Symmetry: D3
């Protein structure tokens, strides 16, 4: 447990980051399920791009999937430290007109370990 | 326009959903499957899809390995868009198999889901 | 000899799968030469996408290259076992209207080993 | 057309420039940052950008590691195109950090640069 | 339209063929080469092409390594589409070379092949 | 020091190749800064694609970035030998009409090593 290729992280509001691939250049690829009260784009998967560099991570999701659109983007900035990813996020809405319309917060993502099945 | 687009979602009768994110010019298909089918591994979490669109023809395959749950298998669907529906035959192979007889068969019919473009 | 990145497999009807790349996520990339009596899209290369997971493999080719089109897609499902990939395939034709128009069969791909030259 | 295009370059007030090479259909953004900001590591060499465009919304993040100079950090900008300008808030995390308080904040306003299509 | 397209095939006078699968918006070229040139390694099997289109300008390079046969070399062509033809100069480098004098030169002229869109 | 993923090479005319990624198939990805007297498309980054195979390398840049266009492509062919990449390059201009309009030359790229900072 650093920040692995094929890891799953769940924040305090129930949402989950599926990192499926971190290539050698540090480039990240995954998808996000939002379960956060009061927000759109819940319960379906959206694509994640970002970067990893040691314990440092950025990732950003576009809120336009096949089932639902919220005309917005989020970008987390954060770090892996003692079994958690602690992040600060910023959310722009399309058509915004000042940095005052940008919404801010903090998510602490705790891991979930890989079950085997069938 | 109608048919198999980028940014289209399709739910089968077992309640599972194919999220098509992207179709290249190439034909290349990329997306997520969420499995919600009674009796199976790997439900309620999303898994990567690769495949191919060609008018109404479509293949797409899912690797059952994400970071919350793995099922040591791959499914490949093969099908066509016909009447506001995608009609597929699927085959499912389990890691370690030694006989084609161990490859499992089914049929899924995917109907378009409700795009709710609002916050 | 598992199912390798950079391997070449030739079925009973003479056709050949060139797997050039299997990334760590298991995602497969290659190209197919069809030599199967009675079929279109013979003797030129078509692109392959698929997945590998242990000895389990899917791959699918679109039958539209630069020289020739057959308005169809094939998808194999199969497994590596004692120096062979044994597969069942299904072929849709664009504009199909029932699952009865879908053609089925079995290919056993045997390997070929890498010659050095110049 | 105007707005956030493929093949558009944007210089902030510290004199740094975002080179946008490609926006997919997807929304996906790919490009280069050259940092020219007084006081920082990793100036005058280009670094990879990933991110996202959505009308006037835009995120983009830079990994400060190319082969001439590395700074053991990532920056993520978040912003919008408004009046022939992209207005961003950035956050910067250093490898090894243990407190959100160590994440650093700023604001960049990027104005379009001069495209000189000639040899 | 005519010129260097996606989904275009081009055979040179030695009988070899460039299969262009995809040109991005970017300019990026992706495809297969089959070498059919008397006297060489690596014939009759397909090899990956990367490169670049820019109106009538075009580079494209082939790595001579697929799973049936490898030749420990790379070829890079450089050329232009002019009169229903692509006219190229190629350079070929062998792994292990120590002198530019060991880089080999030729000229290929590729004429469009016959697209037979039927089953 | 072979030809690495994450290496930087600077030729005799001051230009620099940033190789950020060489995948296992040998496929190369990077970007070029031109500092060569008498040429367009100086001082900004252009995208590189190519191939590596032992000490053999090809790479090609399209001269169309966000800030400046020169309606041209270059392709180097060359090899790594005793801490240098020695190359021969060929430059086509869009709309060229004979192989006589194609410009030729030789670049010897010497390495630069990775500084740490902040
Ligand atoms: O409502 C929207 O515009 C799209 C969904 C936003 C969800 C936000 S992103 C930051 C925070 N973290 C979550 O897990 N959900 C919310
Ligand atoms: O190996 C497993 O059990 C997990 C994947 C199985 C889900 C199958 S795939 C075909 C069928 N159609 C669905 O919607 N789900 C099941
Ligand atoms: O005729 C077509 O529609 C396109 C070519 C189909 C070739 C099929 S795919 C399954 C089988 N395996 C081969 O090697 N060739 C045939
Ligand atoms: O870690 C470092 O010092 C190197 C990168 C810092 C450059 C920063 S990122 C945000 C700010 N805006 C710029 O244009 N450059 C600085
Ligand atoms: O190293 C080898 O011998 C295999 C590749 C050589 C094929 C060359 S590349 C340039 C020339 N043009 C062709 O059509 N084929 C040859
Ligand atoms: O002027 C142009 O058409 C675009 C820039 C060309 C620069 C050439 S490419 C070969 C040579 N090597 C360099 O470093 N610069 C020149």
């Amino acid at each position: 447990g650093g920040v692995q290729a094929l890891s799953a992280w769940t924040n305090q509001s129930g949402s989950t980051l599926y990192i499926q691939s971190v290539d050698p250049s540090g480039s990240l690829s995954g998808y996000y399920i939002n379960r956060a009260a009061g927000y759109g784009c819940q319960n379906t998967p959206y694509p994640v791009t970002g970067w990893v560099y040691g314990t440092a991570i950025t990732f950003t999701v576009l809120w336009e999937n096949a089932t639902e659109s919220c005309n917005s983007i989020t970008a987390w900035t954060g770090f892996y430290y003692q079994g958690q990813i602690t992040t600060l996020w910023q959310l722009v809405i399309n058509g915004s007109t000042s940095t005052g319309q940008i919404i801010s917060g903090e998510d602490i993502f705790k891991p979930s370990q890989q079950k085997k099945s069938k």
